[PDB]
Design a binder for these strands. Structure first.
Ligand SMILES: Nc1ncnc2c1ncn2[C@@H]1O[C@H](COP(=O)(O)CP(=O)(O)OP(=O)(O)O)[C@@H](O)[C@H]1O
Length: 342
RNA sequence: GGCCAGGGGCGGUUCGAUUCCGCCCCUGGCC
């Protein structure tokens, strides 16, 4: 009922970037972002008022959050990246990439209308990650990781210029100059991706990791060791679909494998790494070798003593990553399936 | 909104087991 309010109070609001992208790409979203060419707080305040919902206004920020059902909506006054009015375009030009710099009017006057100045819709059509201007990567070197994320997650490719700049930025050292926190969280974001591996491939292609993770350096075993896990993760997800896991961290572990900074747990520390992870990590050094090596002697029944390690699945997955004892574990899951169904 | 965790819940893997996970709920932390 925002189109109405905005009118009552002679304002212009629009949903923006992030969400508009997914929309075009036909993807349901519960997090919606708005940009008001006036005072967002008031808009948000009256909005909740009319819905009888609580509001969290953040003055000085010119922002306010509220929730209607499972709808998490955020209103923000137009700006220039934190004075004066500032038009939508101005707020929209300080954005990520063209596919993320589009807006849709929720103004009754011209409702539903898609607003794109930078040809984001085209880039979205031609599958392209393109920045708004030359200094883009310099202004915020986190966008590097972002660029790759989307490129990886959407199977989009970087424009000639964008790739050219992106490369400049990396060898210009900016990755080692950005607010670690931003970079860190950005990676956790990618880490959550389902096409995370394909994202990781791009990290290789531009030597990004070699700058963020200190003791890191790419080696072919690990690479195909990654794809190998891809195979497990895929099938497993199909069968033992009953119980899954944030497969993403498994990949990271393998990358972390061949540890660096004194068993670089310090990285898993920066990373808001879950329990099973910070755990399944320590178990690598102690049993990745023994478990496997000592496993080579079994008839049956000692499957039962290894079943105690599944206390946190993952490991059960990092084993198939060694051909020899692959089908062994493949039959385990099926095996126990005969014990529960005598 | 992710995770520390300090106290619940409706479902579970087992024969249980507040030790195992799904999540939700609450209490104080970090991005
Ligand atoms: N450094 C940055 N530069 C430009 N835009 C940024 C930015 N950081 C955040 N944004 C903007 O903030 C929004 C990020 O919010 P999210 O809800 O996580 C959506 P997203 O990152 O666009 O896509 P997602 O649904 O895959 O997460 C985007 O709409 C984006 O334009």
């Amino acid at each position: 009922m925002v189109g109405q309010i905005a009118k009552e109070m002679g304002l212009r609001a629009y949903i923006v970037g992030g969400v508009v992208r997914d929309i075009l790409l036909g993807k349901e979203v519960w997090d919606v972002d708005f940009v008001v060419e006036g005072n967002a707080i008031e808009l948000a305040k009256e909005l909740a008022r009319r819905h009888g919902v609580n509001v969290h206004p953040f003055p000085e920020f010119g922002t306010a959050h509220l929730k209607i059902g499972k709808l998490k909506l955020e209103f923000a006054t137009a700006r220039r990246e934190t004075v004066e009015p500032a038009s939508l375009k101005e707020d929209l030009i300080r954005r990520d990439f063209t596919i993320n710099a589009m807006a849709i009017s929720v103004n009754l006057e011209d409702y539903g209308t898609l607003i794109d100045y930078f040809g984001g819709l085209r880039d979205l059509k031609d599958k392209v990650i393109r920045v708004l201007h030359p200094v883009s990567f310099i202004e915020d070197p986190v966008r590097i990781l972002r660029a790759l994320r989307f490129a990886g997650r959407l199977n989009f490719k970087l424009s000639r210029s964008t790739e050219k700049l992106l490369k400049q930025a990396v060898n210009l050292g900016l990755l080692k100059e950005a607010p670690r926190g931003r970079l860190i969280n950005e990676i956790k974001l990618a880490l959550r991706e389902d096409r995370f591996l394909e994202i990781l491939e791009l990290y290789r292609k531009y030597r990004v990791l070699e700058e963020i993770i200190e003791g890191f350096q790419w080696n072919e075993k690990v690479l195909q060791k990654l794809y190998a896990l891809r195979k497990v993760v895929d099938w497993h997800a199909l069968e033992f679909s009953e119980e899954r896991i944030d497969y993403g961290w498994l990949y990271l572990l393998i990358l972390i494998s061949n540890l660096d900074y004194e068993r670089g747990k310090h990285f898993l520390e920066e990373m808001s790494a879950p329990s099973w992870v910070r755990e399944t990590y320590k178990f690598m050094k102690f049993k990745l070798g023994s478990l496997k090596e000592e496993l080579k002697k079994a008839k049956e029944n000692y499957e039962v003593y290894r079943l105690l390690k599944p206390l946190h699945t993952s490991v059960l997955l990092l084993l198939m990553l060694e051909e020899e004892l692959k089908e062994k574990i493949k039959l385990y899951l099926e095996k126990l399936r005969k014990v529960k169904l005598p």
